[PDB]
């Protein structure tokens, strides 16, 4: 896994930034459209709930970045 991550990063660090941004945006959009295509399935709605949970994690770190995400206590 170390060798795979180093090979993947060193293939990625040779690209310009615009190619990286459009490649990753295309991969994100295609994998998100694959989950919004199939509806009624449980895995796709859990997938989209998990995307909403990552967006929540980013938002709650954004509102308090030196303390972490807001955990209910």
């Amino acid at each position: 896994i170390e060798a795979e991550a180093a090979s993947i990063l060193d293939r990625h660090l040779a690209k310009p930034v615009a190619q990286i941004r459009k490649e990753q945006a295309s991969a994100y959009a295609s994998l998100l459209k694959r989950a919004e295509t199939a509806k009624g399935a449980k895995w796709a709605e859990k997938y989209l709930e998990d995307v909403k949970a990552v967006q929540w994690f980013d938002a709650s770190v954004a509102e308090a970045p030196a303390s972490g995400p807001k955990v209910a206590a």
Partner: protein
Amino acid sequence: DRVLSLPAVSKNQVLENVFHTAPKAPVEHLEKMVSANSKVYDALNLQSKRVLIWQVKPALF
């Protein structure tokens, strides 16, 4: 043949053999490296809004 007494190399050839490359601005270094160190700031500060410390060393609650 008074034209053959003039210097044969044109003024255009002087201006393209003297100003051959467009020169590098002094502000280009500041603009480019500040646009990249903005990402260094945003990822690795602990006070940046979209900091990457909670994605990397996640938490322990």
